[PDB]
Amino acid sequence: PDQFRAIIESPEGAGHVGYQYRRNTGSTMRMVSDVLDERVSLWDFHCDPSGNVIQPGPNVDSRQYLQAAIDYVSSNGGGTITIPAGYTWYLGSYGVGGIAGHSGIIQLRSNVNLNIEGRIHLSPFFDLKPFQVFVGFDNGDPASSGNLENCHIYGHGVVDFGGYEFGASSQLRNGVAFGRSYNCSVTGITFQNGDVTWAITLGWNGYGSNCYVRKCRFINLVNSSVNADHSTVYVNCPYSGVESCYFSMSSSFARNIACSVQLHQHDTFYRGSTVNGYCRGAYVVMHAAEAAGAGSYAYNMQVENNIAVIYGQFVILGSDVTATVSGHLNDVIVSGNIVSIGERAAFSAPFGAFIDIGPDGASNVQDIQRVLVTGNSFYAPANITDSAAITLRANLNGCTFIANNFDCRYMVYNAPGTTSPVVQNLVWDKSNVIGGTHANQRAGQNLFDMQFASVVNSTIEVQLSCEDLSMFSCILFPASCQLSYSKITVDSAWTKSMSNTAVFEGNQQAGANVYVSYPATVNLTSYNTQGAVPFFSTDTNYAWVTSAYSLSINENLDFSPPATYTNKANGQLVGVGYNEIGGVRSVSVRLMLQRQV
Amino acid sequence: PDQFRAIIESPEGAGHVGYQYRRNTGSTMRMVSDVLDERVSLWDFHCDPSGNVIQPGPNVDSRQYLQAAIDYVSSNGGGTITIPAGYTWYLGSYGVGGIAGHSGIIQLRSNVNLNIEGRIHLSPFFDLKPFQVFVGFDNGDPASSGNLENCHIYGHGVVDFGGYEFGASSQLRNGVAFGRSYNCSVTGITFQNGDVTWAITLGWNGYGSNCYVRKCRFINLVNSSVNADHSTVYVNCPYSGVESCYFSMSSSFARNIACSVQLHQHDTFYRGSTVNGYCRGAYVVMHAAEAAGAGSYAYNMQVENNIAVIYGQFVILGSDVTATVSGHLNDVIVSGNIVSIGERAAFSAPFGAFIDIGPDGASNVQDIQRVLVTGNSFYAPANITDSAAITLRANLNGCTFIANNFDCRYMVYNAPGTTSPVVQNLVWDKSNVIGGTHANQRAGQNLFDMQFASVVNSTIEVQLSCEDLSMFSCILFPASCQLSYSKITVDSAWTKSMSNTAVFEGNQQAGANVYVSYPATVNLTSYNTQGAVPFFSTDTNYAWVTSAYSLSINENLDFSPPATYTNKANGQLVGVGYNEIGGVRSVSVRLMLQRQV
Amino acid sequence: PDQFRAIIESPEGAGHVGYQYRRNTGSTMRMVSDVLDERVSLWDFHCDPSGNVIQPGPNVDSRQYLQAAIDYVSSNGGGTITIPAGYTWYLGSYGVGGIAGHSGIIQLRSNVNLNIEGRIHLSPFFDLKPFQVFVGFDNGDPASSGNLENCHIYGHGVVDFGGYEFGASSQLRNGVAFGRSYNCSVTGITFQNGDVTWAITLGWNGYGSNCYVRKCRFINLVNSSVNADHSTVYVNCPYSGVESCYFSMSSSFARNIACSVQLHQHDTFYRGSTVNGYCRGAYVVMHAAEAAGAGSYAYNMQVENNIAVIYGQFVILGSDVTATVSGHLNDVIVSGNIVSIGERAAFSAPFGAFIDIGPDGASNVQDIQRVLVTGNSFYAPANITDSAAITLRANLNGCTFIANNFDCRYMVYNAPGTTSPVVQNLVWDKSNVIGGTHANQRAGQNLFDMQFASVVNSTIEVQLSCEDLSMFSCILFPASCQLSYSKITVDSAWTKSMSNTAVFEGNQQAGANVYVSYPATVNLTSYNTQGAVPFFSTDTNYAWVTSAYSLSINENLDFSPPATYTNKANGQLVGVGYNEIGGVRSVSVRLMLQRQV
Ligand SMILES: CC(=O)N[C@@H]1[C@@H](O[C@H]2O[C@H](CO)[C@H](O[C@H]3O[C@H](CO[C@@H]4O[C@@H](C)[C@H](O)[C@@H](O)[C@H]4O)[C@@H](O)[C@H](O)[C@H]3O)[C@H](O[C@@H]3O[C@H](CO)[C@@H](O)[C@H](O)[C@H]3NC(C)=O)[C@H]2O)[C@H](O)[C@@H](CO)O[C@@H]1O
Ligand SMILES: CC(=O)N[C@@H]1[C@@H](O[C@H]2O[C@H](CO)[C@H](O[C@H]3O[C@H](CO[C@@H]4O[C@@H](C)[C@H](O)[C@@H](O)[C@H]4O)[C@@H](O)[C@H](O)[C@H]3O)[C@H](O[C@@H]3O[C@H](CO)[C@@H](O)[C@H](O)[C@H]3NC(C)=O)[C@H]2O)[C@H](O)[C@@H](CO)O[C@@H]1O
Ligand SMILES: CC(=O)N[C@@H]1[C@@H](O[C@H]2O[C@H](CO)[C@H](O[C@H]3O[C@H](CO[C@@H]4O[C@@H](C)[C@H](O)[C@@H](O)[C@H]4O)[C@@H](O)[C@H](O)[C@H]3O)[C@H](O[C@@H]3O[C@H](CO)[C@@H](O)[C@H](O)[C@H]3NC(C)=O)[C@H]2O)[C@H](O)[C@@H](CO)O[C@@H]1O
Ligand code: NA
Ligand code: NA
Ligand code: NA
Ligand code: NA
Ligand code: NA
Ligand code: NA
């Protein structure tokens, strides 16, 4: 009875006050404490050693209290801890144990979700140091780590990295490393105000499954020249992806170093997202070094329906090897994306591209094939000389382009001098529309500049949609490039006044299995005979031509040249025209030259 | 001790009853009230002046109580107020202060979320009046408004507008106006049973960022002839969009006035949504008048993967100007959408179109370019005369169509008499498939009816997939339309029995930089000579032709006409055929006429 | 005063302890019980008849307690019941009443949501028996069922079917049957460890609207040879769909019987999902037997942006009839999907296809048309003989393919002997890219094997991207197939060494409205005349040819054959070439044969 007042005011008080849901006689006879025990928050562990609550703030290190919360819920089989709204909770010290080797602050645990409604901020303890805010490994060595399963971070809250710069290039910084992560996700959270290597990483070298990042925001996560490299989300487990997210940088350094997403394992996706101020959109890469959990192949890779303003390359494809393992990249789709290179001087950032091959130092280890690039839009402003639909800078075993709209300086490019890629199965369908923004800016340049060691089993069907008489050629193959079993065509529309349409500096268009067609101007002379009369070319450069036809009107009454032509063993063209009256004729005509097509 | 019983039964009672989470000795020693204070609902403010709870209902105006809740949580740095399930909460009066000038009911506040689980209904106080249910402006003048940040409305609940009609055309009605809104969203909510101007508006004249509408339903939000205009979601801030929503109207008036989405600023999207019973799908428009927050350009605009039955136009493109500011629309992608015009009489609703240009009174202020329309399906029933893939009714600086399937009356249309658009960079790739539904319905009509002032730098590659001999022509250019630096082709498949394939009423196909090809029937007569012998056309209408070839078999044994033809200065065609036996020959042949292609 | 202590410890205790939110004098004066009554969990009904809580576990049947919870919340107008984390709740008995006839365990009720955070497991009571875990019908006969409205199942929890096999083929097993379901959804849930017919079904024979499955996982839901058939999600109401889900099977039996999704009513979608280990991706089907709620037509059907490894067919199209009702399928889009047939022996699973027509026993009842298949990737390993872009095994009224990349054994296939489909409006645009994986594996096979009763209003534009000289032909029509009003072309690239390109075993290419072109080798002999001289074919098989042109170079100096040719009534080709010196000439040339193109 005095006992009772004391019990009630004690910490066991709520366990003595009875409750039945809505006065329902059929419901469980409980105590208030039992209903309160259905939820848990940071407030339930944010206390001094005497149990008195501590208010968070800039002079309070909340880390041990959040850890205690996570540890405790973990011991009961899991649940969701709320990080309350209306407060900022500062983190002020490293964690201990298995996450120490990852510079971890907080250790995540299986089945323990965090509902971040308020704000998590890093204290100046972390200035110029490494850190990884949330870590799901439980060992300093990931190979000896257990898994993290069924861990979800969500809510309307914020992770703020406090604006501190990296102290040294070699340091790493992360928001969430799920670790060897199975059914883990981040949803709704804003990550902001940092200089970090990543915001979120998913999986570890192929170990993991079903990890996702959805409806998150990533804002200003690079701020210094010390930051060596940044990729906002690194996807290193299969069956995993990024969807409906927003990424934004404002630093100059971001334009040169930052990528929004890494897809590095099979059945991974990047969709429906908006990117601004980044160097790169996504790398789609199989690293042999990361092939332990899910094999040596990256397949079923999807980059779709994204919106981007970048300064470098939108999608970068690659693979590589180690002494003992070969990585392979195949079965990739890149579709529906609308991308522009932001306003910048030519050459002021890494070379602008929709697709780049990919990635490395060396360019003779890649195995990339069965890639489909379809129904995308790409735009670079007219002054950006270093803008291409594809910069094909390393070996390529296949990539197919259909029904894209590319409006930039080059369609296919690689720098001469540099690498000599071996190219197979490059398909550029006629349904790719080449825009006009760069018209008149192409003096000395080849629209398709095929600076390769070799090209085989490839299709390039060039279709202009406006004039550009500044360009040197539509497509040029240097003498060093071998060409075989390929189809190269230049549609005549908008080409009438071009000196060079297609150029084969080693006369590669003569190969037995090269199928070509392109316009050329040809001078022809007839014999004098009245009636049906042959016309022959004055030059002897057409031994390769299977047929040609006129692309010019005949201003004459008294005669007509042939509508169509074949060739002769000496390299002349020949056709039969008609002299109404006799006389030797001499004409200049625009022809479509054809070989095996 | 008597004191104690009184304290417990008082409103401070729960602050005297102790609690420790799950009896954990390491947890905070709290009081019951502290744990209860972790959440908040409408019940905590829905009380009379003596603090007694009030039951909601049709005779109770809940507005002041919800406002008090919002105001209070706002003062503590935010949180989420629950609008409880199992109840309908009626709103019965206008709000006061800054929202008064917007006819506001409730004022939203920064960081204060609403979890609407029950139903919010408008009382008959609002019949025939304006209203805006939730407003995020804090001033009657938006230019002098502060921002609304981090405000999210979500849950399984409902906003019901009570079915009341507008009282006057000039009135406005809205569900949620976020205002100058940054990181605000609506998720999961059903808006139903109204006559309103909008359901949700995002941003104000470019001010705002990261505003989204996801997984909402909008059902029957137009019901009268007084409603002047309706757009369900108006997106007026950048980096913002609508995803995975459902829109449905059943009113006849909706078919003539209602649009599902307005995208009016850069980096905005409309995706994955289903629309039924609306006039229009989306406007994608840069209004110079709305250019204050985010500049004069709408770029990176995405309409993708939607499903729609509409009565008018699916996507409408536009821009305009004011005295002092010019709006520009560019870098737009429209992809993956499957759209049909619903069953209706011809001309019974605004003209059916997949794309319309856009929007206005005047048609000589627009600057629209770099638009890609790809991989969409469109269908209108055979009786709908007023159905087009594009109604091109105002100036166009570019739009590219690739790999669509359009099955309607017209491919390209504009009404004669009306506007005289100036058209640049219209590209219709050969990979657009023209369906057959309207075959036999086209008497007196031109499949591509090019009723423009001029066309330049344009491509129209016509490819039929079935016969339609009812049509007057595949493509017609009236004499008033200038044509230059363009490519116009008509594939011969399904065209053998057509009198007219392409028609140039001003002989525009003769221009120096016009590249054309199309079938025609030509009568030819030979000279009598045995052996190789010329054939010439009887008409002199072919001065423009660079080459032609036969599309007809030769039923003769004793002779053959030329397989290919050139022309002569008098406008005749000429080729060399072969008389096995001499005689003057006279034949009718179907030729492919070609000019510079 | 003694009374008071007793009241407090009683179940009414919390109704005597006062509370006011955050000590706010303006808030409602409540009691603790009122705030607790804002939420509800399974703990509030999981009690013995004396009200003492029961711990769940493998020897406790939780079913009656969950039912009581649902029943109670239902009586108050709805709300959300939590199934608590950290516990597994076993289900051990059938439900009663209306769900008995559906082998129901739990009955869902309108407006009553379930937030499944822990795990729901089936007890061995259910081994070898039928069951449907959650049922939304309220009558044994669905035709006499009321509706289920506004019922959502969500959270991070799990439904585990306990691994039990089916006891008999004829049994059915389901996770969630919403019933006649309007605004119902499942979000976030993992369904695992079963042998079931379905995981979720939405709607009943067209009755229902706005039902969705989002962000769910379905893992290993087939495990035995007794299971007759499995479809993970069956969508049987309109305006409904599956988005962003993950599906995975590991059983051999799944490879032969299992489909991820059924879309069976209008305005339904399947998007953004990842499938592994299934026989089939989706059926898109109008069954006349299911046409009661929403009519006889399935229209606006979308399968987009999915990722799949299957063993059979990706999308299957169909319709059918009953005595009294005809089903129709139209307005379908299949886009952006990246799909491969998994590693398997040829013929070891149902025939691999991107598209199959569809579905049935009979093949002469279907009405499928206005289907667009665009911008997809498909791959099958080189050893899979039974792999096709389309297996066209029943009547087809239209399907359009544009800008896909198909890398498998056949492009168009149907088995000879078997069905004789009537085919209309099959369009295969030239922008479809045919891959090379199966090169050299095609001995005795036709790349397009047109084994149909008839083809009309169809387009097949064949474009190779590499050589395959193993194949018998690019396209073959047997004599039994009628062909009319169609366009069939074979581009010459990579075809120079092929004996047969296109083959018409009944000489169907001669039809009046057949438009064709393909390469052929032809032997020609000239007359002896010096000068312009005719060359004629030695064979008389070209009565159908309207023109031909050379695809071969001329190795001769003293003469040239014609660049172009027509024909003569006896079936010879003829052209005019040039003898510099006279003599009879005899040459073998590769020509492009053309008819009406
Ligand atoms: C920034 C970025 O992602 N850049 C990629 C580039 O990635 C390579 O380079 C980056 C540079 O930051 C990473 O290399 C750094 O980090 C690794 C891994 O850290 C260690 O292991 C983790 C688990 C632990 O928590 C840490 O404390 C460290 O012990 C270092 O080993 C390396 O020395 C350091 O430079 C990246 O490594 C990957 O990082 C992901 C995500 O964290 C891990 O899942 C992978 O295991 C790890 N891979 C390897 C092989 O260790 C490097 O892969 C790409 O190569 C390039 C092409 O795609 O694109 C971007 O430039
Ligand atoms: C229904 C619809 O959206 N129709 C568009 C059409 O939009 C123009 O016309 C509509 C007609 O309803 C709007 O014009 C009406 O409303 C504006 C704005 O309301 C005022 O300002 C707001 C902030 C405040 O809350 C209100 O109390 C008012 O003070 C009025 O000024 C105008 O007189 C009235 O007719 C629409 O205006 C825009 O509305 C959006 C969303 O609310 C605001 O964010 C914009 O600021 C505002 N724009 C301007 C210039 O004020 C008009 O833009 C489109 O023009 C057309 C082409 O896209 O498509 C549909 O027909
Ligand atoms: C597994 C699968 O979906 N396979 C489809 C195939 O579907 C047909 O065959 C399956 C085989 O499981 C279904 O037929 C079985 O179930 C129906 C319906 O069950 C009865 O009604 C329900 C409401 C009740 O809960 C049950 O207790 C039963 O009374 C049986 O009538 C039939 O005898 C049995 O074999 C499927 O039926 C459909 O099932 C869906 C989803 O549950 C219901 O919404 C439909 O009402 C019901 N349709 C009909 C006509 O009853 C059959 O349609 C497809 O036909 C095929 C082509 O798409 O693809 C897969 O193979
Ligand atoms: Na480390
Ligand atoms: Na070389
Ligand atoms: Na106003
Ligand atoms: Na004009
Ligand atoms: Na039954
Ligand atoms: Na037949």
> Quick one: which of B72, B117, B118, B86 has its CA closest to C27?
B72
Nearest-ligand number for the alpha carbon of B170: 2
* Degrees to nearest 5, angle at CA A88 with A83 and A92: 95
CB atoms within 10 A of CB B569: 14
Nearest-10 Cα torsion for C482, C488, C492, C498: -20
Using only the alpha carbons of chain B, give its radius of gyration. Answer: 33
Return the number of CB contacts < 8 Å for B and C: 266
- The answer to whether A176 and A153 are in contact (CB under 8 A) is yes
3-state secondary structure of A22: helix
Using only the alpha carbons of chain C, give its radius of gyration. Answer: 33
* Degrees to nearest 5, angle at CA A366 with A360 and A372: 105
C20 and B11: CB-CB below 8 Å? Answer: yes
> Quick one: which of A575, A567, A539 has its CA closest to C554?
A567
3-state secondary structure of A319: strand
What is the C-alpha separation between C179 and B376, in angstroms, rounded? 33
CB C289 less than 6 A from any atom of ligand 3: yes
What is the C-alpha separation between C82 and B159, in angstroms, rounded? 25
What is the C-alpha separation between B563 and B281, in angstroms, rounded? 51
What is the C-alpha separation between C595 and C597, in angstroms, rounded? 5
Q: How close is the nearest chain B Cα to the Cα of A287, in Å?
A: 33
CA distances from B465 to B340, C208, C262, C279 (A): 20, 38, 31, 34
How buried is residue A441: exposed, middle or buried, by Cβ count under 10 Å (0-12/13-18/19+)?
middle
Residue type, A248: S
* Degrees to nearest 5, angle at CA C216 with C214 and C219: 150
Residue of B nearest to C545 (CA): B553
Residue type, B363: S
- The answer to whether C494 and A485 are in contact (CB under 8 A) is yes
3-state secondary structure of B275: strand
- The answer to whether A162 and A193 are in contact (CB under 8 A) is yes
Q: Residue for token digits 């039929």?
A: B464
CB atoms within 10 A of CB A50: 6
User: Which helix (H) or strand (E) segment is B428 a member of?
Assistant: strand B426-428
What is the C-alpha separation between C339 and A85, in angstroms, rounded? 44
What is the C-alpha separation between A41 and A157, in angstroms, rounded? 14
Q: How far apart are the first and last CA of chain A?
A: 105
- The answer to whether B475 and B502 are in contact (CB under 8 A) is yes
What is the C-alpha separation between A384 and B486, in angstroms, rounded? 27
- Expressed in angstroms and rounded, the spacing between residue B174 Cα and the centre of ligand 6 is 12
The answer, yes or no, to whether the previous bond of C359 is cis (omega within 30 of 0) is yes
- The answer to whether A551 and B596 are in contact (CB under 8 A) is yes
Q: What is the 3-state secondary structure (H, E, C) of B366-389?
A: CCEEEEEEECCEEECCCCCCCEEE
Structural domain A512-597, CATH architecture: Beta Barrel (2.40)
Spell out the CATH class of B81-511. Answer: mainly beta
What is the C-alpha separation between C300 and A86, in angstroms, rounded? 46
- The answer to whether B337 and B314 are in contact (CB under 8 A) is yes
For residue C436, list chain A residues with Cβ-Cβ distance below 8 A: 425, 457
Pocket test residue of A172, A173, A222 for ligand 1, highest count of atoms within 8 A of CB: A172
B513 and A576: CB-CB below 8 Å? Answer: no
Breaks (C–N over 2.5 Å) after residues, chain A: none
Residue type, B267: D
3-state secondary structure of A187: strand
Q: Residue for token digits 């393992």?
A: A325
The answer, yes or no, to whether the previous bond of B359 is cis (omega within 30 of 0) is yes
What is the C-alpha separation between B406 and B390, in angstroms, rounded? 10
CB A273 less than 6 A from any atom of ligand 1: no
* Degrees to nearest 5, angle at CA A317 with A314 and A322: 140
Interface test with chain A among C33, C216, C218, by most A beta carbons within 10 Å: C33
> Quick one: which of B182, B194, B190 has its CA closest to B154?
B190
What is the C-alpha separation between C425 and A247, in angstroms, rounded? 45
Residue type, C419: T
CB A131 less than 6 A from any atom of ligand 1: no
CA distances from A313 to A358, A388, C132, C410 (A): 10, 9, 51, 36
- The answer to whether A96 and A105 are in contact (CB under 8 A) is no
The answer, yes or no, to whether the previous bond of A56 is cis (omega within 30 of 0) is no
The answer, yes or no, to whether the previous bond of C118 is cis (omega within 30 of 0) is no
CA distances from C360 to A479, A538, C318, C328, C371 (A): 59, 68, 8, 14, 19
Residue type, B306: N
Q: Can you say how many angstroms the Cα of residue C111 is from the centroid of all Cα atoms in its chain?
A: 32
CB atoms within 10 A of CB C383: 14
Task: Give phi and psi for C74, each to the nearest 5.
Answer: -55, -40
Q: Residue for token digits 């799901």?
A: A136
For residue B73, list chain C residues with Cβ-Cβ distance below 8 A: none
What is the C-alpha separation between A419 and B341, in angstroms, rounded? 53
- Residues 6 or more apart whose Cβ sits within 8 Å of residue B346: B383, B384, B385, B386
What are the tokens at C81? 């019941």
CA distances from A138 to A236, A266, B378 (A): 18, 25, 55
- The answer to whether C227 and C195 are in contact (CB under 8 A) is yes
CB A262 less than 6 A from any atom of ligand 1: yes
Residue whose CA is closest, atom 61 of ligand 1? A229
- Expressed in angstroms and rounded, the spacing between residue B480 Cα and the centre of ligand 7 is 5
A465 and B425: CB-CB below 8 Å? Answer: yes
- The answer to whether B342 and B379 are in contact (CB under 8 A) is no
Q: Which atom belonging to ligand 3 lies closest to the Cα atom of C142?
A: 23
For residue C307, list chain A residues with Cβ-Cβ distance below 8 A: 267, 269, 300, 302
CB atoms within 10 A of CB B288: 18
What is the C-alpha separation between A188 and A211, in angstroms, rounded? 15
CB C359 less than 6 A from any atom of ligand 3: yes
DSSP line for C514-541 = EEEEEEEEEEEEE---SEEEEEEESS--
Residue of C nearest to A431 (CA): C431
Task: Give phi and psi for C101, each to the nearest 5.
Answer: -70, -10
Query: Which among A36, A308, A431 has the least Cβ separation from residue B403?
Result: A431
What is the C-alpha separation between B134 and B161, in angstroms, rounded? 12
- Expressed in angstroms and rounded, the spacing between residue B421 Cα and the centre of ligand 7 is 9
Q: What is the 3-state secondary structure (H, E, C) of C359-407?
A: CCCCCCCCCEEEEEEECCEEECCCCCCCEEEEEECCCECCEEEECCEEE
- Residues 6 or more apart whose Cβ sits within 8 Å of residue B386: B346, B347, B351, B352, B409
How buried is residue A256: exposed, middle or buried, by Cβ count under 10 Å (0-12/13-18/19+)?
middle
Query: Which among A76, A431, A576 has the least Cβ separation from residue B431?
Result: A431
Annotated binding residue A101? yes
Residue type, C335: S
- The answer to whether B65 and B41 are in contact (CB under 8 A) is no
DSSP line for B454-499 = EEES-EEEE--SS--TTBSEEEEE-TTSEEESEEEEE--TT-TT-S
Residue type, B390: I
- Residues 6 or more apart whose Cβ sits within 8 Å of residue A67: A95, A106, A107
Q: What residue ranges in B100-253 does DSSP mark as E strands?
A: 104-107, 112-116, 119-122, 131-135, 148-149, 152-154, 158-160, 173-177, 181-187, 190-192, 200-202, 208-214, 217-219, 230-235, 240-243, 246-248
Residue of C nearest to A397 (CA): C436
Using only the alpha carbons of chain A, give its radius of gyration. Answer: 33
Location of each CATH 2.40.30.250 domain in chain A: 512-597
What are the tokens at C125? 């009571």
C305: DSSP letter: S
- The answer to whether C513 and C545 are in contact (CB under 8 A) is no
Residue of A nearest to B330 (CA): A379
What are the tokens at B170? 């000039």
Interface test with chain B among C546, C560, C574, by most B beta carbons within 10 Å: C546
- Expressed in angstroms and rounded, the spacing between residue A140 Cα and the centre of ligand 4 is 6
- The answer to whether B437 and B407 are in contact (CB under 8 A) is yes
- Expressed in angstroms and rounded, the spacing between residue C108 Cα and the centre of ligand 6 is 46
A571: DSSP letter: S
- The answer to whether A52 and B29 are in contact (CB under 8 A) is yes
What is the C-alpha separation between B479 and B496, in angstroms, rounded? 26
User: Which helix (H) or strand (E) segment is B32 a member of?
Assistant: helix B32-36
Give me the helices (H) in A323-466, please. Answer: none
3-state secondary structure of A65: helix
What is the C-alpha separation between B29 and A44, in angstroms, rounded? 8
* Degrees to nearest 5, angle at CA A203 with A199 and A208: 150
CA distances from A502 to A198, A457, A491 (A): 45, 18, 11
> Quick one: which of B385, B378, B390, B391 has its CA closest to B348?
B385
Half-sphere exposure of A384 (CA within 13 A, CB side): 26
Residue type, A381: P
- The answer to whether C99 and C57 are in contact (CB under 8 A) is no
What is the C-alpha separation between C282 and A231, in angstroms, rounded? 36
Q: Residue for token digits 């107008």?
A: C77
What is the C-alpha separation between A22 and C115, in angstroms, rounded? 20
Nearest-ligand number for the alpha carbon of A101: 4
Pocket test residue of B207, B234, B236, B268 for ligand 2, highest count of atoms within 8 A of CB: B234
3-state secondary structure of A430: coil
- Residues 6 or more apart whose Cβ sits within 8 Å of residue C257: C222, C227, C228, C229, C230, C279
Among left, alpha and beta (phi > 0; psi -120 to 50; other), residue A35 is alpha
Q: How far apart are the first and last CA of chain B?
A: 105
> Quick one: which of A112, A105, A37, A117 has its CA closest to A65?
A105
Query: Which among C32, C569, C575 has the least Cβ separation from residue B556?
Result: C569
What is the C-alpha separation between C140 and C132, in angstroms, rounded? 13
- Expressed in angstroms and rounded, the spacing between residue A390 Cα and the centre of ligand 5 is 20
What is the C-alpha separation between C381 and C512, in angstroms, rounded? 41
User: Which helix (H) or strand (E) segment is A256 a member of?
Assistant: helix A254-257
What is the C-alpha separation between B190 and B215, in angstroms, rounded? 9
Pocket test residue of C196, C231, C253 for ligand 3, highest count of atoms within 8 A of CB: C231
Give me the helices (H) in A502-583, please. Answer: none
Residue whose CA is closest, atom 3 of ligand 1? A231
- The answer to whether B532 and C575 are in contact (CB under 8 A) is no
CB atoms within 10 A of CB B158: 22
What is the C-alpha separation between C209 and C373, in angstroms, rounded? 26
Residue type, B461: E
> Quick one: which of A335, A410, A338, A411 has its CA closest to A373?
A335
What is the C-alpha separation between B450 and B190, in angstroms, rounded? 44
- The answer to whether C255 and C276 are in contact (CB under 8 A) is no
What is the C-alpha separation between C68 and C85, in angstroms, rounded? 20
- The answer to whether B223 and B251 are in contact (CB under 8 A) is yes
Identify the CATH homologous superfamily for domain C1-80.
Answer: Hk620 tailspike protein, N-terminal domain-like (6.10.20.90)
The answer, yes or no, to whether the previous bond of A358 is cis (omega within 30 of 0) is yes
Give counts: helices (H), strands (E), chain C.
Answer: 4, 55
How buried is residue A345: exposed, middle or buried, by Cβ count under 10 Å (0-12/13-18/19+)?
exposed
Q: Which atom belonging to ligand 1 lies closest to the Cα atom of A101?
A: 27
Q: Which atom belonging to ligand 1 lies closest to the Cα atom of A142?
A: 23
B226: DSSP letter: S
- The answer to whether A467 and B458 are in contact (CB under 8 A) is no
**Which residues are registered as beta bridge partners of A339?**
A308, A378
CA dihedral sign of residues B553, B559, B560, B566: negative
CB A115 less than 6 A from any atom of ligand 1: no
CB C171 less than 6 A from any atom of ligand 3: no
Query: Which among B39, B248, B403 has the least Cβ separation from residue C403?
Result: B403
- The answer to whether A331 and B324 are in contact (CB under 8 A) is no
Residue whose CA is closest, atom 22 of ligand 3? C102
B564 and A564: CB-CB below 8 Å? Answer: yes
Task: Give phi and psi for C422, each to the nearest 5.
Answer: -90, 120
A551 and B35: CB-CB below 8 Å? Answer: no
What is the C-alpha separation between A493 and B429, in angstroms, rounded? 13
CA dihedral sign of residues C227, C228, C229, C232: negative
Give me the helices (H) in B148-305, please. Answer: 254-257
- The answer to whether A282 and A270 are in contact (CB under 8 A) is yes
Q: Which atom belonging to ligand 3 lies closest to the Cα atom of C174?
A: 42
- Expressed in angstroms and rounded, the spacing between residue A375 Cα and the centre of ligand 4 is 42
* Degrees to nearest 5, angle at CA C259 with C255 and C262: 170
- The answer to whether C376 and C404 are in contact (CB under 8 A) is yes
Q: Residue for token digits 């022959």?
A: A536
CA distances from C120 to C56, C60, C190 (A): 10, 12, 10
Residue type, C210: N
CA dihedral sign of residues C306, C311, C315, C319: negative
CA dihedral sign of residues A450, A452, A454, A458: negative
- The answer to whether C309 and C338 are in contact (CB under 8 A) is no
- The answer to whether C506 and C484 are in contact (CB under 8 A) is no
Location of each CATH 6.10.20.90 domain in chain C: 1-80
**Which residues are registered as beta bridge partners of C550?**
C591
CB burial string A121-152: b at 16+ within 10 A, e below:
bbbebbeeebbbbbbbbbbeebeebebbbbbb
For residue C596, list chain B residues with Cβ-Cβ distance below 8 A: 492-493, 496, 551-552, 590
